Design a protein around this ligand. Sequence first.
Ligand code: HEM
Ligand code: HEM
Ligand SMILES: [C-]#N
Ligand SMILES: [C-]#N
Ligand SMILES: [Mg+2]
Lengths: 110, 110
Amino acid sequence: AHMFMAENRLQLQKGSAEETIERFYNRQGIETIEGFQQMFVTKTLNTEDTDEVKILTIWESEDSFNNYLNSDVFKEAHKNVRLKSDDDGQQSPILSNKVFKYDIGYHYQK
Amino acid sequence: AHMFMAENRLQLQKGSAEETIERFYNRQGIETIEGFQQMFVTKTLNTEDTDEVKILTIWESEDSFNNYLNSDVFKEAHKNVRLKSDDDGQQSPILSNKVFKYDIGYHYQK
Ligand code: HEM
Ligand code: HEM
Ligand SMILES: [C-]#N
Ligand SMILES: [C-]#N
Ligand SMILES: [Mg+2]
């Protein structure tokens, strides 16, 4: 069975990458989720006028990802997550998010 | 301090992801490079035009990755690689590559 990766790509107001990444430091239950293997939270290195933060999650299967999305644990972790565009998103530097999905065809870990 | 991720993004002819991914199964020395940690080879799902395959490499530092690019093993692994546009490359499904670079702000592995 092929592993699976999801990417949540966040476009952020310039300068806000570091404060946004810090939100991911403390766990909110992902460690309890069936099929979850790893998470990376990254800042893209470039000269763009917005920041880009990506959340990569590695899963034993797409199904395990799908089940996480429907889970109480996911819902709870995201209850206070808002976008700049939301009516109550005044304090949010998160301009947009876009989800990308991938088959992991090969993995090596030293 | 912070880990580092490099991405090589391969823009491929439609349908060629799987044959391309198979070329990455066999290690060619990257695992001997100081600071190398992990490699993922991904296929982007639900693409309708060109196929897309990404090679993600995870490093102890940007310096480690920089050293890999200068290495003999990098050279040896890539010596027979051709883009479709190369004089002898017409049969290659590889249309282009683009490199992206990331600071890893947070990582969790179950
Ligand atoms: C594909 C759907 C999504 C996945 C797989 C995902 C994954 C995750 C994970 C694994 C965590 C850590 C939670 C934990 O430690 O238990 C998290 C938290 C977080 N996510 Fe997502 N997420 C998704 C949707 C979104 C969306 C749409 C946004 C909008 C910006 C977002 C922004 C955030 C933020 C800001 C945090 C930190 C939580 C906080 O501030 O309390 N996520 N997410
Ligand atoms: C010049 C454009 C590049 C193209 C078209 C390309 C394509 C390829 C191909 C087709 C292979 C498998 C070779 C084979 O069939 O034996 C390969 C190997 C590999 N490439 Fe690239 N590549 C390029 C540059 C890069 C860059 C810049 C990186 C890192 C950012 C990278 C990371 C890797 C890794 C880790 C391997 C496996 C090497 C090993 O196991 O030692 N490649 N590349
Ligand atoms: C959420 N990423
Ligand atoms: C080469 N990727
Ligand atoms: Mg296909």
